[PDB]
Amino acid sequence: QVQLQESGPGLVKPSETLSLTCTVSGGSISSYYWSWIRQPPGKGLEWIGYIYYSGSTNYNPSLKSRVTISVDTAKNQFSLNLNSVTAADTAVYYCARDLREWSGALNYYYGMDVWGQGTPVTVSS
Amino acid sequence: IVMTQSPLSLPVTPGEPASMSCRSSQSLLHSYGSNYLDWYLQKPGQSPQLLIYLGSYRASGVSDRFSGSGSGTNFTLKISRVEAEDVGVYYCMQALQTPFTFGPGTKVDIK
Amino acid sequence: LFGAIAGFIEGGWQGMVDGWYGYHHSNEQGSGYAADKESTQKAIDGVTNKVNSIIDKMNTQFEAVGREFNNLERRIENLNKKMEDGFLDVWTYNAELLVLMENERTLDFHDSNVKNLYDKVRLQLRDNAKELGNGCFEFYHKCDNECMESVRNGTYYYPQYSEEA
Amino acid sequence: LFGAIAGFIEGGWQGMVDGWYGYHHSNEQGSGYAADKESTQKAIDGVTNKVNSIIDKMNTQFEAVGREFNNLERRIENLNKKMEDGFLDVWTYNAELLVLMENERTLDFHDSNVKNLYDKVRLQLRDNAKELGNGCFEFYHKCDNECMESVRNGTYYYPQYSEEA
Amino acid sequence: LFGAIAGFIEGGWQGMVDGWYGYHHSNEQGSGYAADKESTQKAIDGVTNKVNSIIDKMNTQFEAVGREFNNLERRIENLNKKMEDGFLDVWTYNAELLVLMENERTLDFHDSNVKNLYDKVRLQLRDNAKELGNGCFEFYHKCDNECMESVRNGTYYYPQYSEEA
Amino acid sequence: ICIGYHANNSTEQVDTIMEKNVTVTHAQDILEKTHNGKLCDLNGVKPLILKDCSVAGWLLGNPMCDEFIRVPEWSYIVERDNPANDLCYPGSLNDYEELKHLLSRINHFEKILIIPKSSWPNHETSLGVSAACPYQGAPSFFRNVVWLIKKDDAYPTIKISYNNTNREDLLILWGIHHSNNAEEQTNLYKNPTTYISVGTSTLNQRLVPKIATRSQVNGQRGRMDFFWTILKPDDAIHFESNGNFIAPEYAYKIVKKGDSTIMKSGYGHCNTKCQTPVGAINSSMPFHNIHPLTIGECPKYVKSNKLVLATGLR
Amino acid sequence: ICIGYHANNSTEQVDTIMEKNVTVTHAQDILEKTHNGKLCDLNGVKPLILKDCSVAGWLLGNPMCDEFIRVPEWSYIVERDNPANDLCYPGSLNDYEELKHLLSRINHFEKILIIPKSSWPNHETSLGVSAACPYQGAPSFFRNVVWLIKKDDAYPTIKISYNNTNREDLLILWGIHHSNNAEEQTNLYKNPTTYISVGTSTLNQRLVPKIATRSQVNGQRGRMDFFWTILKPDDAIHFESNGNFIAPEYAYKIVKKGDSTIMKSGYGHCNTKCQTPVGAINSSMPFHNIHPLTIGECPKYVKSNKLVLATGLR
Amino acid sequence: ICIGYHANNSTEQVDTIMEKNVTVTHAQDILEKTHNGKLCDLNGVKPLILKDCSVAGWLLGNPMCDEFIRVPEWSYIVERDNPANDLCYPGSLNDYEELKHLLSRINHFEKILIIPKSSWPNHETSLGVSAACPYQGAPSFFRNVVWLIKKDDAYPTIKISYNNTNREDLLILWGIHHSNNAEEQTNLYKNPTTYISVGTSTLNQRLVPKIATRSQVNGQRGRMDFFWTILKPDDAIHFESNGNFIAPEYAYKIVKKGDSTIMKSGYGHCNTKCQTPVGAINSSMPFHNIHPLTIGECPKYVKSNKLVLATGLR
Ligand SMILES: *[C@@H]1O[C@H](CO)[C@@H](O)[C@H](O)[C@H]1NC(C)=O
Ligand SMILES: *[C@@H]1O[C@H](CO)[C@@H](O)[C@H](O)[C@H]1NC(C)=O
Ligand SMILES: *[C@@H]1O[C@H](CO)[C@@H](O)[C@H](O)[C@H]1NC(C)=O
Ligand SMILES: *[C@@H]1O[C@H](CO)[C@@H](O)[C@H](O)[C@H]1NC(C)=O
Ligand SMILES: *[C@@H]1O[C@H](CO)[C@@H](O)[C@H](O)[C@H]1NC(C)=O
Ligand SMILES: *[C@@H]1O[C@H](CO)[C@@H](O)[C@H](O)[C@H]1NC(C)=O
Ligand SMILES: *[C@@H]1O[C@H](CO)[C@@H](O)[C@H](O)[C@H]1NC(C)=O
Ligand SMILES: *[C@@H]1O[C@H](CO)[C@@H](O)[C@H](O)[C@H]1NC(C)=O
Ligand SMILES: *[C@@H]1O[C@H](CO)[C@@H](O)[C@H](O)[C@H]1NC(C)=O
Ligand SMILES: *[C@@H]1O[C@H](CO)[C@@H](O)[C@H](O)[C@H]1NC(C)=O
Ligand SMILES: *[C@@H]1O[C@H](CO)[C@@H](O)[C@H](O)[C@H]1NC(C)=O
Ligand SMILES: *[C@@H]1O[C@H](CO)[C@@H](O)[C@H](O)[C@H]1NC(C)=O
Ligand SMILES: *[C@@H]1O[C@H](CO)[C@@H](O)[C@H](O)[C@H]1NC(C)=O
Ligand SMILES: *[C@@H]1O[C@H](CO)[C@@H](O)[C@H](O)[C@H]1NC(C)=O
Ligand SMILES: *[C@@H]1O[C@H](CO)[C@@H](O)[C@H](O)[C@H]1NC(C)=O
CATH class of the missing domain: 2.10.77.10 (Hemagglutinin Chain A, Domain 2)
Known part of the structure; x- marks a missing residue:
């Protein structure tokens, strides 16, 4: 029973960095990919990016240039704080484990077993 | 990869088989023969739950009612018998290459 | 090889029945056939040990234990049959070459015994005899039955009988 | 073994061409390197039969058949490989030792034939011919072409030619 | 077989240690023993080549690799067991026959070496030296250490020392 | 001289x-x-003459020539080079030849009645025979194995376990009947999807019948794949089957072992x-x-x- | 002297x-x-020189190996040790080494049309072409067997028996297409659960598709395991199959049965x-x-x- | 003279x-x-002295055999004639004799963690049932292969596709657990009809558990038949199973090859x-x-x- 708990404020204004961190409570941040996926209102899920537990980074080209990437394995957490926020980035941001093992010798894909409950971020002046 | 679900809203009824189709714009058959398409369910006001993975194989805690199939661009999900819990948005997400995308999402609802 | 059997001995006697090797003693005090049973006994012990050793080494052949194989194991039945036939041919070559080699060596060994008997009847007598080309020694000194017994007994001593006159 | 070829016979005469062996006679009539058909014929027949025996016994040996095996039969594959190599090693050792022993036997059976010619011509000419070390018997009696051909033919008579002088 | 060891020679010596073969000289200057280095070295080289050939032709044999087969494969397990035991019996018979035949041929080759050394000394001296039965040669001429050394070497000149008595 | x-x-x-x-x-x-x-006779012991019978017809008692109620000790099993009366109902004894290799080590057989014919109470035991196996001018099946068949329009599951309490091996025998088609399955066995599970230490098997159309051999267009094992002392055979079970009725305990060979010519x-x-x-x-x-x-x-x-x- | x-x-x-x-x-x-x-030439007879071709590639007619569609008398079967064109589509001829052993004594094969393509009424035999074997660059499967597929959105159960009706031992090669996944089955063979049930007098076989994900070999991910049988005189082969059937279309009468071998040097x-x-x-x-x-x-x-x-x- | x-x-x-x-x-x-x-030691290299330990107990790491968790280069494996700690859980490695023939030419292994236990997300690592393998109390299982039990009452399909990116052969050992009956299945693997579909480029298997009643062996009535394969460079092992899977945790990268053996002596x-x-x-x-x-x-x-x-x- 692994839980991924979202942190940070749910409020932000334009032209700054929105803060949010994902703490892995009940499990660990080892040997797993970790991804963030947004749900804008009235629109399908959009995948932001993911970070390997070592720290190997991959981004969405739609938000490649302005997404901070970071993993803090000391407290078993990972945080990606979107920067240069525009008004259109209002979305529910979900944590997710990823079981891709996409690089290296192993390749096994169960895929996104555990998700966070979500944080309703609201970009507003 | 650009994906589309042919039922944008599948009006289902309880206690009856049902199915939906999800179509990609690229051969999703990854190396090692696995399709790398996940089916996620999202109930009203709840996080996504992985119904199926790699086309057909079920996730833990998912009943035998759900089953998927397809190899090329075409894919299909099949609920052998539908229940009230199945109401929600079904996303078909490819996982072949790094830019992951989701389908428009098929809102299965009671007819 | 030494060429006494069917060589300088023209032919074997049929009168002698006892012993492979012997002397046709021809003396004033009777004549007949004898047998140097010391050398002959050594040869018989040698041949007996030859046969005994041949059978002793030949109690280890590849006995062909019966084995069968089904229709979809033709590889393995050919494997077993080629193993059995190859072992049988190796042991056939071994046995045939042994009863060829040892037959040649046994004829050569009896030739050796005949030539060694000739050599001791040449070396005990030395100049006291006259060595003929048909395997006989015409003693220059007249000799008696006791002398012709001594000669087959290996005790003949050159000092007495030395006179060649 | 008998120590004539390369021993007291210093070297094979290059004059002879009609036989493996033969008699060279220094005489007023002619040097005449002349062979002995009888001895040489038995030698050539012996060796012909010998070669026939090796080809007869060496037939029906292990016929290596190129049977192959799949991935999950490494045991039977190694069994076939080691059996083929084992019969190959056994038959290679058999052939190698056979030709080795036969080169020994044949190079000493030619020595046997030379010593047989030597000691039959020694047994003939009992006292009339000196047994010089080199391998040449210098006749005390005066001898012509016919007596040379007779010792070649094995019909010499010591009583007729007995000339002690 | 050739009839020197346990033949006309009574037995071996306890004075000579320098080699397998040699002479014992009872001379006015001194009485002693001395190895014949030529024939002895030939014998040692022959036996060394014999040992080298034995190990080389036995350098390749059936290497009994451990191929274990489970129960219910008793056909193939028995095939492996009988194959390994068959190659073991073939190589055991080969090794036993090889060492036995080569022991016979080496004792007989040493018999040949003693007989050829006897035939060498006898030929070098011919009628000059009275030939005794027990491998002895009593010289009619009084021989010093130099002529003994030349007999050992081989360079004996028979026309010298040619006095009859 | x-x-x-x-x-x-x-x-x-x-x-x-x-x-x-x-x-x-x-x-x-x-x-x-x-x-x-x-x-x-070898060693003053009468061999097994086994006239006009097969080792698979000997161990599984072939009624056409079944002079084997009591067999004495032998020294070699004289099979036929040309098998006559060999497995009258056709088929294939699995590991027939490795069984023969074992029979080249066993010098005496005793036919212990491990299972009597009252063990099977819901299956017809002796009243199911075959025309390919004649005795007395009538269809008689092998007498060392039961050709089970549906009784009372039903087939219970066998679930029989034996214990080798005899302190010696038993050389168990059984088989599976490959029917001609599905209709032969239904008419003989009430279950179409049948399995024969066998459990011993060092052996597990789950045999399914290869139902198929097949050529006519010895009259009948069916086969019987016979199987066997060696049940060690204190080991337990565990049979189970809802169909096609050629049940055992006679096992063969080894009393003596040694040297033997299965010769083939008279x-x-x-x-x-x-x-x-x-x-x-x-x-x-x-x-x-x-x-x-x-x-x-x-x-x-x-x-x-x-x-x-x-x-x-x- | x-x-x-x-x-x-x-x-x-x-x-x-x-x-x-x-x-x-x-x-x-x-x-x-x-x-x-x-x-x-062994005794004035042409060796069969399979140039860049194998025994499997020869018997199962490989499009890269078309110089031996009709073959005269031979003595050898000369093959390359690393054959380039050998089972282009991935697979494994079962008992392939046994087949080579049988071919080490067959001096002649008369190719015979036991099963013409007109004997496949309800099944397609033209579209069964694989890119692994190209014929001069176009897709083309082997010709001595037909890789059947569904026709008219159906794959009716083949049930065909061939009586030998010859005084010779004709060889029959078929196969099972071990597909990659259920979608490839449904695209090729409308029946998802399929079986190849073969029957001879001395051979019962039932095969199922191992629909398992596998590596890519020769540009293809599926597999095809091939199976051979020698049919003795007056015998009858019986093929039943509702899917995955690499059905036979040619056979190889053994006109001459002497002595031969297979040599792997080019x-x-x-x-x-x-x-x-x-x-x-x-x-x-x-x-x-x-x-x-x-x-x-x-x-x-x-x-x-x-x-x-x-x-x-x- | x-x-x-x-x-x-x-x-x-x-x-x-x-x-x-x-x-x-x-x-x-x-x-x-x-x-x-x-x-x-042979030429300065010490052997592998498996003391009361078999090659099955070594390669599938026995808890009683813990001296060999990281082995150096050797020159010849050594084992006892009848080792005690040999597959403490009853069963038998399939092609065990093949594997011990193959290890007669490998002079060194490197144990590489191909598949860490973190790569079993939806499966449990609470596997304390193998009481036949005691080591310091409360035994669980071997260390080199993990016996997966259901997690949250569920057993998802185990689809892993490890690719030997290393340039050396890997020896991957897995297995199938034959349960006592259906009760142990539904208590261990929620799916009753389970299978394994290992899919190397050369290999193709579809294993199924042969669940059936079986005798006491080592105080356990189940069985575990293990399997092995040589995954070559650039190849890819494809495990696919939804039950009864002794999944691999460690592979043995064959870094050195040569001449070795197994002496089977104390x-x-x-x-x-x-x-x-x-x-x-x-x-x-x-x-x-x-x-x-x-x-x-x-x-x-x-x-x-x-x-x-x-x-x-x-
Ligand atoms: C052999 O045959 C000859 C023929 O003349 C005869 O005189 C002789 O008695 C027979 N027996 C023996 C032992 O030579
Ligand atoms: C030879 O000596 C051995 C020494 O162990 C002895 O046992 C044997 O009886 C002797 N005799 C023979 C003929 O081997
Ligand atoms: C015969 O030899 C033996 C043994 O040396 C001897 O005791 C015996 O006196 C000898 N007899 C004669 C008559 O020479
Ligand atoms: C051998 O060679 C020498 C030197 O060339 C020559 O005189 C002699 O004639 C040759 N003899 C034979 C037989 O070849
Ligand atoms: C040897 O004698 C046998 C028996 O009389 C005969 O058949 C054979 O032909 C003879 N062989 C020779 C080469 O004279
Ligand atoms: C040679 O010896 C034979 C022996 O039969 C004899 O007949 C012949 O007269 C002798 N002389 C010649 C010239 O052949
Ligand atoms: C052999 O023993 C004798 C008697 O004791 C002794 O005199 C002699 O030195 C010994 N010989 C050797 C070579 O050891
Ligand atoms: C024998 O001579 C050959 C050359 O003909 C040479 O290669 C070989 O090594 C020589 N062997 C010996 C032992 O002299
Ligand atoms: C010994 O023999 C050699 C052989 O080369 C010869 O040169 C030497 O002169 C001989 N010595 C004596 C002292 O006879
Ligand atoms: C030996 O074999 C013969 C063959 O006729 C047979 O009559 C006899 O009974 C056997 N047994 C003996 C002689 O003890
Ligand atoms: C054997 O082959 C060689 C190949 O170089 C050839 O020169 C020779 O003429 C051939 N001999 C026969 C007898 O065919
Ligand atoms: C094959 O043909 C022969 C001859 O007509 C016939 O006796 C036999 O029954 C046939 N076999 C089948 C299986 O139809
Ligand atoms: C092993 O043999 C070698 C080579 O002869 C030698 O140096 C060494 O001392 C031997 N070791 C033992 C323990 O005997
Ligand atoms: C069989 O019998 C023996 C003695 O009664 C017993 O120890 C054993 O447990 C029994 N059952 C099995 C399955 O071995
Ligand atoms: C294994 O990895 C290599 C390198 O990424 C890749 O080219 C190959 O296709 C992969 N799989 C197989 C089965 O060859």
């Missing part, structure tokens, strides 16, 4: 590598070159220290040229005709 | 146990160490009594160092570089 | 065909009748150029008579007890 050699009027011929067809004196023959042409009232297929051989000869397979303290096969060693001067 | 022996100016070398280099007089060499170096216009994989030994001499594998009136292989037999002296 | 030959007080005896127990002056004892009676420290299972041997003799199996450059086994080449004059 002439030296010569023994001669006689002999014509015995030996061979040498340098010269062949040389005659010698007292030529010691070491190849027997003869056999009596009859099957004699009985003589006589005694012999050694035996070959074509005939018996008793003699002190080291070698023999009759046949490869020999049972007893035998000579050694050479595959030749002239091994007469020479013990003679000439 | 003077005894003595023959001396020549020869330099022939022979080995004895006590001295390993003896200068002997005209000793005949009994080991022929040389060869032609090319593939010659044509010469010449005549050879005895051939070898690397060359062809024509001279008559007891031994040869060329290779282990030979067939015909051949010498005896010996792994040694010198077997000169000292027939002569010195 | 007097011709003759030396003698001495020696008593070594040789044999011939015609005479026996012949005294000689000096003869080489070519038979090595002496062994040190211990097992040591450790010294001295130098040993050659070894025998009974005990090591250190001499330059041509022959020996200790045991059949050997390793390294050694003398040649001969069953005889007295091989003495007479290098002297009687």
